[PDB]
Amino acid sequence: SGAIYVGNYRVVNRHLATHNDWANLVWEDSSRDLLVSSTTAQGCDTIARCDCQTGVYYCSSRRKHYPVSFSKPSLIFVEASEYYPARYQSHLMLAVGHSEPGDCGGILRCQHGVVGIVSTGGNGLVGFADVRDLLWLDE
Numbered sequence: 001s002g003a004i005y006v007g008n009y010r011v012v013n014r015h016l017a018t019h020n021d022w023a024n025l026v027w028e029d030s031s032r033d034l035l036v037s038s039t040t041a042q043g044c045d046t047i048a049r050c051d052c053q054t055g056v057y058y059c060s061s062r063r064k065h066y067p068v069s070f071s072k073p074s075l076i077f078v079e080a081s082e083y084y085p086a087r088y089q090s091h092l093m094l095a096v097g098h099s100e101p102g103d104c105g106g107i108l109r110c111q112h113g114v115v116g117i118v119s120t121g122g123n124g125l126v127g128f129a130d131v132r133d134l135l136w137l138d139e
């Protein structure tokens, strides 16, 4: 689990969005596994606007942060799950690092701010949904 709180927005994995997220929907994209809902309180986070390919992510299944080198956002095949049919997930960055299903929502940060959230993984990989291109989160 986990979310990004920026301005009056809450960014979550679309597959973990709550009834309240859907009732306050701003934007969602199944191909990216992202959903953004509106909030009444001002958020605590800021978003990176950069091309970093290294950073640190929070891994809830280890209660620890780990450093990673990750690929640039791209279209990657993701096998069927209980949440989605077999499809290509867009804006996805892969890295070598531990992850388990419940680790979705962990934040990836570089020195500039939040880069994205855990969205896929397994067998020693961890995949992050990028949010750096969503410029409207800042206004």
Ligand SMILES: CSc1ccc(Br)cc1CC(=O)N1CCC[C@H](C(N)=O)CC1
Residues within 6 Å of the ligand: 015, 033, 078, 081, 083, 084, 089, 099, 100, 101, 102, 103, 104, 118, 119, 120, 121, 122, 123
């Ligand atoms: C951190 S995810 C993970 C980690 C380890 C293992 Br084994 C397996 C997973 C994958 C997983 O649980 N899902 C369910 C959530 C949907 C997601 C998606 N973005 O389409 C991909 C599939």
Ligand SMILES: [Zn+2]
Residues within 6 Å of the ligand: 048, 049, 050, 051, 052, 110, 111, 112, 113
């Ligand atoms: Zn950066």
